[PDB]
Structure 1
């Protein structure tokens, strides 16, 4: 029961927190507070070499 307030229109908010720069890129979904995290992901966990 993940957000059991079932109305099929009650949208559930989060925040994303993109940290972009050179040599990296992060995507860090969290709740409204930034205290609880949901699947932080990067660019280095997908490609093979370090210059891409």
Structure 2
């Protein structure tokens, strides 16, 4: 019939991770991060690295019989920043261009209802 999977995208200011699993999430199909396609630590969160990683993951998934994916994109969340980095949209676009169909798209960033205390003291980073 139709084999559909899930693409988990983890986007921060330092890196990007693209992880394709099956429909239930318990079996991993492919997994690629920004540090596996570039040489400079400064280029890990760039959109171009996201495109490269997404292309590699999409090819590996396509060779195994996956047809389309639903997308779940997240920032670090918690007591860290709630906003996704610059590589999320580039990752989303590259998956479609590689040949996979796209289902529904939603963000699953974990948000606290007044949880724990963040780092930096009561004055924050002083730079």
TM-score by length of 1: 0.74
> Based on CA coordinates, which of the two structures has the bigger radius of gyration?
2
In 2, Cα distance between the equivalents of 1:45 and 1:22?
Answer: 17
3-state SS of the aligned residue for 2:4? coil
Give structure 1 stretches of 5+ with no counterpart.
1-9
Structure number having the greater helix percentage: 2
2:19 aligned with 1:28:
yes
Tell me the C-alpha RMSD between the 2 structures.
0.9
Point out 4+ residue stretches in structure 1 off by more than 4 angstroms.
none
2:6 aligned with 1:12:
no
Aligned length: 43
Q: 1:16 offset after TM fit, Å? A: 0.3
In 2, Cα distance between the equivalents of 1:43 and 1:51?
Answer: 10
Q: 1:39 offset after TM fit, Å? A: 1.3
Give structure 2 stretches of 5+ with no counterpart.
44-127
3-state SS of the aligned residue for 1:41? strand
2:38 aligned with 1:51:
no
